[PDB]
Structure 1
């Protein structure tokens, strides 16, 4: 299935939108994971929340200034602190003359601009906010409550990691950026754009993630032995074509879901003011990637959690063998 590793787009029926797990698995029987990313479009009736009133007076306690440096499509990005603000103020700042989305004829134009001018006017990302905009009544694809095996982490261990097993909110503006990464422990991620302007994703198929690693070692020489876990690298598509790294690019509109799959390297940016919600999740398929996830050796990035419970409970036949691989 899916021989060209293309980003597949699904339009589940209402019935198919009932069991989250079961549809993930169906997307995989059609080969979605081979691209490392898929778009899902919710049924017409489905809604995340009745209305987005009073999201104005919500508090972004610690927004981040994203300072890039480098050029010719290759940058390290670093995060610096900036003042607290309401979303009202952020919306307003993100539409001001300094941060607003530049005039552009089409996508190719916008992209050219983002990658040419990255180091200027460092944008402020309202990122990593612990919360959710989903209605409790929303029972299909509600990111607070997916009901996947990732929940084994909290029931077995009492282990809660923010943005991993509880959701994060992302208030974006033009040029706000996510560096090249696979998710923590190479988990799946799912992201819902709640509102506003689009988000662009670039994605490398899992089959080739190593090529991407290999390349990042040349572009940032002197580098854990798993550099990309720092999530500091920006690399433009031109630079990927130049070096023969397969990738795809897709632009997410408001109202749409993206799911990244284990070991699917991805990065991208926002086109303007927007608000996104995301969480990680897991399936039985992920366990083996979990146990395999290459961790940062220098300390700069976290070994997020222990695979122990997952193997013990869900792979009981292989558990003894897995322990002997340890200490």
Structure 2
């Protein structure tokens, strides 16, 4: 069975440390860059409202066949997607969705990825820009009303719309509506950028991270074990199908860290930190790459 990797660092900053994100990320860097990913829990009273246009939120999610690599050898609203997502998970595990242990979904996910006897297919609302129906965070752009008690979140530095995105030389957040077993494979960001991820609500998002000092080790294991048909593909195209069990990387000496990102918690990925993961159930996430 799947052996869970060690847990990545979790930080619970005080209200003083929560004042500036870039200053806090720079301070946790000596530890967090050695694990690739880290989790940040805001103070208990920091609860931003959900500001998406729920009435008109409509999308067609992508189809994900979990074992498509091993096999080589519908429009929804937010409500209707949640109904499908909860029905899928409760039927699959034969129990209420909130009662399924996170370790069981994790163990079953990686079994289905390498299973040729069972073909499980899920859907992922992963191609949703914040310009379509608004960001999950409140913003002061006029397109939606802002209550007085919500203005601090529209101006907060932890609002992903207020993160610095311009790199020095001579973009808006994206949304993810997940269900059980919907996943994203191993990849790094463009220009080796940072990324910050916020789970607005729903069941946890399970993460796996590799520190940047082991990036070549991971790419070497990929070169050895990924399907030969995709071996000569460039990294940008290969990372569309870089599905690999974390234990396989750990067996080859690649350090891997995990975490369960729960509602209201941040996940930061450091430069050139390979990461992957899957969703425990119906949830809503927002992500953006930022610069330091």
How far residue 237 of structure 1 moved from its aligned partner, in angstroms, is: 2.2
Number of the residue aligned with 2:3:
none
Q: After alignment, is 257-266 or 111-120 more displaced?
A: 111-120
1:225 to 1:236, Cα distance in 2 relative to 1, 3 A: same
How far residue 114 of structure 1 moved from its aligned partner, in angstroms, is: 0.8
Number of the residue aligned with 2:86:
95
SS at match of 1:267: strand
What TM-score comes out, normalization by structure 2 length? 0.79
Deviations 1:86-128 (CA, angstroms, capped at 9, x unpaired): 1111001111247856258644332221111236331110112
How far residue 215 of structure 1 moved from its aligned partner, in angstroms, is: 0.8
In structure 2, C-alpha distance between the alignment counterparts of 1:101 and 1:201, rounded to whole Å:
22
Deviations 1:9-59 (CA, angstroms, capped at 9, x unpaired): 21122232222221121112x42111111111111111221x57963x342
Q: After alignment, is 122-131 or 60-69 more displaced?
A: 60-69
Deviations 1:133-179 (CA, angstroms, capped at 9, x unpaired): 10232122000112x2x3357xx89xxxxxxx201111000000010
In structure 2, C-alpha distance between the alignment counterparts of 1:181 and 1:218, rounded to whole Å:
17
In structure 2, C-alpha distance between the alignment counterparts of 1:231 and 1:95, rounded to whole Å:
27
In structure 1, C-alpha distance between the alignment counterparts of 2:250 and 2:71, rounded to whole Å:
17
Number of the residue aligned with 2:65:
67
In structure 2, C-alpha distance between the alignment counterparts of 1:212 and 1:53, rounded to whole Å:
37
In structure 2, C-alpha distance between the alignment counterparts of 1:194 and 1:247, rounded to whole Å:
25
Establish whether residue 143 from structure 1 lines up as the match of residue 160 from structure 2: yes
In structure 1, C-alpha distance between the alignment counterparts of 2:10 and 2:191, rounded to whole Å:
25
In structure 2, C-alpha distance between the alignment counterparts of 1:169 and 1:113, rounded to whole Å:
25
Structure number with the higher helix fraction is 2
Number of the residue aligned with 2:126:
127
Q: Which runs of no fewer than 5 residues in structure 1 stay unpaired?
A: 77-82, 158-164, 284-327
SS at match of 1:92: helix
Number of the residue aligned with 2:272:
263
Number of the residue aligned with 2:248:
239
SS at match of 1:120: coil
* Contact 1:39–1:256 (Cα < 8 Å) also in 2: yes
Counterparts of 1:156-175 in structure 2 under 5 Å?
165-175=171-181
Alignment length (residue pairs):
257
Q: After alignment, is 238-247 or 203-212 more displaced?
A: 238-247
1:214 to 1:95, Cα distance in 2 relative to 1, 3 A: same
1:41 to 1:100, Cα distance in 2 relative to 1, 3 A: farther
1:211 to 1:199, Cα distance in 2 relative to 1, 3 A: same
How far residue 129 of structure 1 moved from its aligned partner, in angstroms, is: 0.8
1:262 to 1:99, Cα distance in 2 relative to 1, 3 A: farther
Q: After alignment, is 214-223 or 175-184 more displaced?
A: 214-223
In structure 2, C-alpha distance between the alignment counterparts of 1:142 and 1:75, rounded to whole Å:
41
1:124 to 1:207, Cα distance in 2 relative to 1, 3 A: same
